[PDB]
Ligand SMILES: *[C@@H]1O[C@H](CO)[C@@H](O[C@@H]2O[C@H](CO)[C@@H](O[C@@H]3O[C@H](CO)[C@@H](O)[C@H](O)[C@@H]3O)[C@H](O)[C@H]2NC(C)=O)[C@H](O)[C@H]1NC(C)=O
């Protein structure tokens with residue numbers, strides 16, 4: 001009375017008959033598939049497997065989703081019309097179709113992500129935070145909304161669509177939270193270290209001079225000011241400056 | 257005067273001579289490699305490439321690290337002994353040999369991880385936290401030590417050894433920070449949700465009954481108590497209990 005296949009597989013529909021039966025046919029909601037051994041429908045996927053005195057069965061190959069529905073087996077038995085039906089159920093692997101693109105905001109702003117997934121049954125969609133601190137799910141919905149976002153809430157967020165039709169599927173969104181720089185380290189060959197998003201752009205100063213080379217070894221988070229010791233103007237109070245889209249800060253360093 | 261090869265490659269040592277030269281030889285710190293065309297050493301890796309009036313060169317195949325050192329070319333020129341030397345330098349890809357195994361402590365305890373890496377030059381070793389909040393490195397040393405560890409400090413820590421000899425190499429340690437459960441959600445079919453490390457073990461109660469089935473749908477972080485509505489003893493004050501190695505907590509839930 002129920003038969004379930006996955007999209008693309010073949011569905012075999014069976015009907016039990018006996019020696020009281022004089023006519024038999026399969027129908028797809030008034031579209032004749034088979035009347036006896038005669039194929040009425042033009043659907044090339046539909047074939048006949050058996051027509052004995054006990055069983056009358058067909059097969060729908062390469063099953064689609066439109067095929068889902070009731071299929072009717074009509075007979076003429078003892079001059080009594082009789083009807084037996086089967087319900088073809090079609091399943092589809094879950095898939096994420098449209099998911100919010102990568103996003104970059106400033107600390108304190110809001111976000112709203114959407115993960116649109118399809119499948120049969122309609123899939124369960126959940127969001128998860130890719131972070132060591134995370135436990136369970138951030139959202140058990142097709143939506144994820146965060147207000148007053150903080151640096152610790154940045155990182156990847158993973159959508160996951162599931163309906164037990166074979167594998168569950170995922171697809172990630174990267175959330176970047178921007179914030180002005182702050183100094184991580186500063187001491188005196190001579191280096192300072194700053195953390196920022198976007199990455200810090202470093203610039204050194206001495207008595208407000210920019211100190212152009214020939215008259216620095218930089219990283220996205222670290223800047224070294226290197227020079228030979230015990231030399232001309234070997235004075236302290238160098239100022240490390242970390243610049244960024246959202247602001248700037250600094251710290252002064254001595255030598256001896 | 258200097259020649260550098262990677263371990264396993266071949267090192268070609270050259271010497272420039274002229275028509276004043278009457279003798280010539282290559283030596284490995286008093287071990288004769290070649291005297292003219294005569295191979296004295298038994299090392300099968302050492303071959304002769306040229307012996308013209310202008311150049312005298314050999315080749316050390318499948319170079320090892322013990323081979324590193326000075327190699328001497330002796331000659332007899334104008335009856336004057338002359339000596340020219342070359343320094344073979346051997347490089348080795350960086351490798352992490354021993355790294356602290358995975359570790360699991362309680363929130364507030366200490367850890368100390370060590371990453372022992374080898375290579376030529378002796379590699380630069382750094383630690384990095386695999387977390388969205390991380391910027392730069394946790395430690396620029398072969399050691400990483402954390403006291404009063406917190407949940408947000410858990411997760412993977414990556415060692416990275418580098419010396420620019422081809423690829424840098426990494427190898428991770430997983431730090432798990434245990435903490436007693438706390439309730440994330442509780443409301444009323446009827447479910448509660450708790451976060452813990454190790455994962456929470458759930459148990460429901462009603463007027464101190466344990467409510468054995470036949471007389472619950474559980475997850476490592478979530479527990480559902482399911483039953484038909486509008487029925488016998490359809491009362492509230494169900495108590496969700498989250499148990500763990502390190503403690504336990506609970507919360508009560510109503511129905512209507
Ligand atoms: C059982 O009967 C139903 C209805 O009598 C059959 O359904 C029809 O199947 C076709 C193809 O499988 C569907 O067609 C297409 O239309 C869409 C636009 O809607 C178009 O984008 C496609 O390219 C294609 O042309 C049609 O919509 C669908 N109709 C209904 C009402 O579901 C079904 O195929 C029959 N089963 C078997 C096994 O023959």
Ligand SMILES: *[C@@H]1O[C@H](CO)[C@@H](O[C@@H]2O[C@H](CO)[C@@H](O[C@@H]3O[C@H](CO)[C@@H](O)[C@H](O)[C@@H]3O)[C@H](O)[C@H]2NC(C)=O)[C@H](O)[C@H]1NC(C)=O
Pocket residue numbers: 284285287299316320322323
């Ligand atoms: C240039 O001369 C030096 C020294 O005269 C040669 O060094 C020696 O090389 C051998 C093999 O390359 C080394 O041997 C081994 O000993 C270790 C234990 O230390 C053992 O575990 C190994 O299985 C192997 O038996 C030896 O230690 C090393 N000696 C020194 C002082 O470095 C070098 O090979 C010469 N170069 C060429 C190209 O012939």
Ligand SMILES: [Cl-]
Pocket residue numbers: 094095096097169170171
């Ligand atoms: Cl997908």
Ligand SMILES: [Cl-]
Pocket residue numbers: 104105106178
């Ligand atoms: Cl922005």
Ligand SMILES: [Cl-]
Pocket residue numbers: 130
């Ligand atoms: Cl993960």
Ligand SMILES: [Cl-]
Pocket residue numbers: 170171172173
């Ligand atoms: Cl992805």
Ligand SMILES: [Cl-]
Pocket residue numbers: 151154155176177178197388389
């Ligand atoms: Cl960030």
Ligand SMILES: [Cl-]
Pocket residue numbers: 184195
């Ligand atoms: Cl910091």
Ligand SMILES: [Cl-]
Pocket residue numbers: 195196198199200220221391392
């Ligand atoms: Cl950065």
Ligand SMILES: [Cl-]
Pocket residue numbers: 198199201243244245
């Ligand atoms: Cl910037």
Ligand SMILES: [Cl-]
Pocket residue numbers: 350351352353425426427
């Ligand atoms: Cl390695």
Ligand SMILES: [Cl-]
Pocket residue numbers: 360361362434
């Ligand atoms: Cl423990």
Ligand SMILES: [Cl-]
Pocket residue numbers: 386
């Ligand atoms: Cl990473």
Ligand SMILES: [Cl-]
Pocket residue numbers: 426427428429
């Ligand atoms: Cl690893």
Ligand SMILES: [Cl-]
Pocket residue numbers: 132133407410411432433434453
């Ligand atoms: Cl943890």
Ligand SMILES: [Cl-]
Pocket residue numbers: 440451
């Ligand atoms: Cl929480």
Ligand SMILES: [Cl-]
Pocket residue numbers: 135136451452454455456476477
């Ligand atoms: Cl858990």
